[PDB]
Enzyme design. Sequence first.
Site, mmCIF file in Angstrom:
data_model
loop_
_atom_site.group_PDB
_atom_site.id
_atom_site.type_symbol
_atom_site.label_atom_id
_atom_site.label_comp_id
_atom_site.label_asym_id
_atom_site.label_seq_id
_atom_site.Cartn_x
_atom_site.Cartn_y
_atom_site.Cartn_z
ATOM 1 C CG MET A 1 -1.957 1.096 1.104
ATOM 2 S SD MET A 1 -3.367 0.693 2.418
ATOM 3 C CE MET A 1 -2.138 0.816 3.897
ATOM 4 C CB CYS B 1 1.041 8.600 9.800
ATOM 5 S SG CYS B 1 1.065 6.996 10.847
ATOM 6 C CD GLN C 1 -3.310 7.691 15.368
ATOM 7 O OE1 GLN C 1 -2.630 6.712 14.836
ATOM 8 N NE2 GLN C 1 -2.952 8.054 16.673
ATOM 9 N NE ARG D 1 -5.950 2.824 13.646
ATOM 10 C CZ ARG D 1 -4.710 2.617 13.668
ATOM 11 N NH1 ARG D 1 -4.255 1.637 14.384
ATOM 12 N NH2 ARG D 1 -4.055 3.199 12.837
ATOM 13 C CG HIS E 1 -3.641 9.376 10.981
ATOM 14 N ND1 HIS E 1 -4.822 8.477 10.897
ATOM 15 C CD2 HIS E 1 -2.770 8.873 11.289
ATOM 16 C CE1 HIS E 1 -3.995 7.308 11.125
ATOM 17 N NE2 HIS E 1 -2.697 7.581 11.164
#
Lengths: 357, 357
Positions: B12, B122, B149, B256, B263
């Site tokens: 990915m 990230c 996130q 999450r 995010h």
Amino acid sequence: MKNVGFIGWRGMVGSVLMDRMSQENDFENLNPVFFTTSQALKSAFDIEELKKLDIIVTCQGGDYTNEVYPKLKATGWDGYWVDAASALRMKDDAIIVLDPVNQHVISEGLKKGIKTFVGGNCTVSLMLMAIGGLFEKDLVEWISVATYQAASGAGAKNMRELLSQMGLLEQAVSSELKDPASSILDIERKVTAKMRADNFPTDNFGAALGGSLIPWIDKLLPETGQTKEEWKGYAETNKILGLSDNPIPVDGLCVRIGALRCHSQAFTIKLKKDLPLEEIEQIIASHNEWVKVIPNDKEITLRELTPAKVTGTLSVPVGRLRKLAMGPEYLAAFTVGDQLLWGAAEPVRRILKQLVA
Amino acid sequence: MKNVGFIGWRGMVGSVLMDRMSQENDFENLNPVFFTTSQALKSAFDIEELKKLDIIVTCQGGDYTNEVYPKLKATGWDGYWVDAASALRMKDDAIIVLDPVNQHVISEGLKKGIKTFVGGNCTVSLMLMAIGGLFEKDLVEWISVATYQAASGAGAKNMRELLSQMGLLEQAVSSELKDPASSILDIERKVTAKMRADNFPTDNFGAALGGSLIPWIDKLLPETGQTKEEWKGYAETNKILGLSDNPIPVDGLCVRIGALRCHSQAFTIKLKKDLPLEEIEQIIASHNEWVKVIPNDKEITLRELTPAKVTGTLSVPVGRLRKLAMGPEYLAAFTVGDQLLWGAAEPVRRILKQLVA
């Protein structure tokens, strides 16, 4: 037995009150009279019928309140007005109830002749039910908040909207998902394409919620830049603790996410004095029979501290407790609570039980 | 033209790098060699083939790195190792790249002979790209964070899981939703019933995400109670700013939620000196060409500051800026950024462009 009228009992908040009341057999100790706004029981607009009641409990909404309450209190009516709407929360002659937290203020208010009791803001109540201990020991200097709010706080049509949204997002890639070898990027392109489409239902939220978030709840208050929702943190939290004189700072960002009925909140709490995380947990846990301290473990946090877990239950878990890098006086906390119960119906049902005892 | 090997380019993160590289015609200025772990191009495990390369770019993962990198640097290989994995971020001879923020540190590192450049976390990168200004003027004492996130941070199967979850939650009440008069409470009972069922797919997250949230990301660090994810806030943010000596406190809770690839983060930022919200916005906005300051208006915040908005774009919006009740030195901020771009692929693609110039 005191005679009690119920208004807006067929709505979502009202419906939860009825069920909870039935579950606890609250109707056994009072004389219930039910009203309605329909022209299809009495009329919620019949001031004289309302005048005969000892207590009125409304879950109808601010509009109903601002139109009826004044006319009623005008006739001289000496009864008790119980409201779930925000309309009267700040008034001088009204108290914001949350008996497990501010019973003292309520008792004093009763002995002083207060006749209007209003349930508080879901976010704030869920917060106080969680970290009440801290506030009871006067160990809170201020609290920075960040919330993950459920659609139920905005309304029933908002919940249905959220569900349709999730529905369409998956249906947009339903075949690709079954294919264990399909491209994850192509799939994301598609779902995002649908989220952004014209026929993607966003009339109630005014933007996508499913697969996203909305960091803005309620109206903007030009005065502080806050949203009415964010403002209630500072305002309502103090009035509830009976500390309007020397108010403790509570502020942050209220964000809406894709959950049905539990609000979650992340807190950075500035304690006025450094205590060992261990003592703090007991101070939190012992405050009431609902707050639940979840040990800072992974499997446990994944099983206890989530909307999936507390939805539709009276349990108010609080976890992820520990000291924050800013120093030993800084505490980290995360909590989950059902918006329709401790955040709406419960406090109201609780002050009612007291009023008819 | 320098010879560059690519590893894990079919994953990915790797796939996003390729597309972004292609979009900017990055292959025109370098000699690309592609590797693979398959036994179905060269072998990513052929140390001698790798030795011939001037630069290596891996998006393969920490495991690959810890097994190959040592053996390679052992042969005396003098090339540049570019990694997206966290494996080498803290090492003494490695620098965490985010050129729009720490170009100075990178230049200095190049002139000093550093040969290992690692993309950063990230969450942290998305934060620095948002409020870089503040850090560049040394106006940040500390920052309390709360994140929302996306599933892409955990992996592709995690994204598919989230989508199936939303799918099943709607399908559980698909008929009831079409009925404009159906009970909202009965519907919620059902969806919640399915979220809690045995056949509800939660193998990847270890709990429900769709219609819920998980306030725990990564492993628990017994040392501070943080999660590896939360820890990287303090650690990586400072190493990136080249301030490991006098580290600025950055801490909070990493949560999450049900979003695919962006995010979002809510910040309470303690400024070291009180400035007018107006000046602060320019200091934020002028820092880089990506950060975007969204005025504190409702319609605008609903159209610009959301995952639905920034997904798949290089734009990094920051809004809801204002002073926090704790005083004038307290700033509130909310931001949104794509995890796969500035949070993964972009920084890597950027240091590569520099290395082959």
